[PDB]
Amino acid sequence: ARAAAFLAVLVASAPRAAERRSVIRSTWLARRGAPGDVWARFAVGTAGLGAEERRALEREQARHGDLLLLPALRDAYENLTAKVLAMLAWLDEHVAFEFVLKADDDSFARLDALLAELRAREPARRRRLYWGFFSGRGRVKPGGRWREAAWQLCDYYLPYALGGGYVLSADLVHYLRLSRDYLRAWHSEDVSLGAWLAPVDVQREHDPRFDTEYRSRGCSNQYLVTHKQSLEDMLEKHATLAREGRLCKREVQLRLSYVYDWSAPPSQCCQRREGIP
Binding mask 184-223 vs a second copy (x if CB under 8 A, - otherwise)? x----------xxxxxxxxxx-------------------
C-beta of 86 vs 248, nearer to a second copy: 86
C-beta of 42 vs 157, nearer to a second copy: 157
Q: Under rule CB under 8 A, how many of the chain's residues touch a second copy?
A: 37
CB under 5 A: which stretch of 14-22, 104-112, 136-144, 174-182 binds Mn ion?
104-112
β-sheet bridge partners, residue 253: 218
Q: What is the DSSP string of 241-263?
A: HHHHSSS-SS-EESS-B----TT
CB of 80 to Mn ion, least distance (A): 9
C-beta of 108 vs 175, nearer to a second copy: 175
Residue 263 binds: one of Mn ion, a second copy, none (C-beta under 5 to 8 A by kind): a second copy
What is the Cα–Cα distance from 14 to 49, expressed in whole angstroms? 12
Q: Does 60 bind Mn ion (CB under 5 A)?
A: no
Residue 198 binds: one of a second copy, Mn ion, none (C-beta under 5 to 8 A by kind): a second copy
C-beta of 17 vs 140, nearer to a second copy: 140
Q: Does 75 bind Mn ion (CB under 5 A)?
A: no
- Name, in order, each residue with C-beta under 8 angstroms of 85's C-beta and a sequence gap of 6 or more: 176, 180, 183, 192
Cβ 17 vs Cβ 47: under 8 Å:
no
Q: Scan residues 103-142 and list those touching a second copy (CB under 8 A).
A: 136, 140
C-beta of 196 vs 223, nearer to a second copy: 196
- CA-nearest of 184, 189, 139 to 166 is 189
Query: What contacts 24+ positions apart, CB below 8 Å, involve 243-246?
Result: 246/221
Phi then psi dihedrals of residue 40, to 5 deg: -130, 135
CA distances from 28 to 20, 161, 247 (A): 12, 21, 11
CB of 88 to Mn ion, least distance (A): 17
Residue 104 binds: one of a second copy, Mn ion, none (C-beta under 5 to 8 A by kind): Mn ion
- CA-nearest of 8, 6, 32 to 238 is 32
What is the Cα–Cα distance from 171 to 21, expressed in whole angstroms? 28
Residue 103, H or E segment = strand 99-104
β-sheet bridge partners, residue 100: 8, 168
C-beta of 159 vs 164, nearer to a second copy: 159
Name the DSSP letter for residue 186.
Answer: -
C-beta of 42 vs 99, nearer to a second copy: 99
CB under 8 A: which stretch of 18-26, 115-123, 177-185, 212-220 binds a second copy?
177-185
Note the residues at the interface with a second copy (CB under 8 A).
Answer: 136, 140, 143, 147-156, 158-159, 171, 175, 178-179, 182-184, 195-204, 262-263, 265-267
